[PDB]
Amino acid sequence: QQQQQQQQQQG
């Protein structure tokens, strides 16, 4: 199945 894509909120 699919792999969840995430992002750090502070950049």
């Epitope: 909120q9 502070q10 950049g11």
Partner: antibody
Framework: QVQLQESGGGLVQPGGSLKLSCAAS????????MYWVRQTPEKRLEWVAF????????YYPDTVKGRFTISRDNAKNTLYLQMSRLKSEDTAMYYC???????????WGQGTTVTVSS | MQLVLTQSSSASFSLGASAKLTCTLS???????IEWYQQQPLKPPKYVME???????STGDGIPDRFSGSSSGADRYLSISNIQPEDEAIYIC?????????????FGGGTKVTV
């Protein structure tokens, strides 16, 4: 302490338009992604818009894509949501939010209500 | 299949009693990490916790230790022990998928925990 304060809501008509604002404080605004999330009268939550820290990227769900526009003025520490071609279904409490780590909605504002009626 | 979150039905509980809420991910996304949110009357939603497929989780600020999370397959759980009066709220789970082509965020229908 992180603070988000929305404003701009009110009574409007279908086909109309209005622009919401969210004043941010308690953190370095330009370093964070920002969002708009709404809650319908039936209490259902729906993510409405995303904007990257410098305003470079934006994303919207199909329900509002060609009608809503999220923007920000980092110098003013303010987030905006331009709502055009309003639909009755846009009636909801609108919240601005900020994330933490990998969580999108860690901090929420108090909300502003947009009421669309014929 | 689209990313969907299905939540357990709203129920009433007795003070002190225990409760177990369920949020089930669509099969294609059974490994996803979700978020649990709590919304008390006339208040905005509050970040309760980030729950991973392995059961590991991290709660938000002001979240009572009696609040715990676990998982099982596509199921993500929120267990409230020692149900207090301030626990009466709507609990909504959410899941994000920052796909570059198009970001997606889905919220569950919510579970009313009447106490």
């Amino acid at each position: 302490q992180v603070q988000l304060q929305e404003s701009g809501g009110g009574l409007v008509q279908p086909g109309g338009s209005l622009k919401l604002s969210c004043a941010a404080s308690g953190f370095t605004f330009r370093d964070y992604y920002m969002y708009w999330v709404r809650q319908t009268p039936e209490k259902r939550l729906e993510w409405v818009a995303f904007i990257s820290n410098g305003g470079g990227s934006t994303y919207y769900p199909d329900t509002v894509k060609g009608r809503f526009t999220i923007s920000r003025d980092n110098a003013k520490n303010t987030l905006y949501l331009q709502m055009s071609r309003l639909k009755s279904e846009d009636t909801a409490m609108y919240y601005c939010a900020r994330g933490r780590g990998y969580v999108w909605f860690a901090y929420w504002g108090q909300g502003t209500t947009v009421t669309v009626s014929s | 299949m689209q990313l969907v979150l299905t939540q357990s039905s709203s129920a009433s509980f007795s003070l002190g009693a225990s409760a177990k809420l369920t949020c089930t991910l669509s099969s294609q996304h059974s490994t996803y990490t979700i978020e649990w949110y709590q919304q008390q009357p006339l208040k905005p939603p509050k970040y309760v916790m980030e729950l991973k497929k392995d059961g590991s989780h991290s709660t938000g600020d002001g979240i009572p230790d009696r609040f715990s999370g676990s998982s099982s397959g596509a199921d993500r759980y929120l267990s409230i022990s020692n149900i207090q009066p301030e626990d009466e709220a709507i609990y909504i789970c959410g899941v994000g998928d920052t796909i570059k082509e198009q970001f997606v965020y889905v919220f569950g229908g919510g579970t009313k925990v009447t106490v």
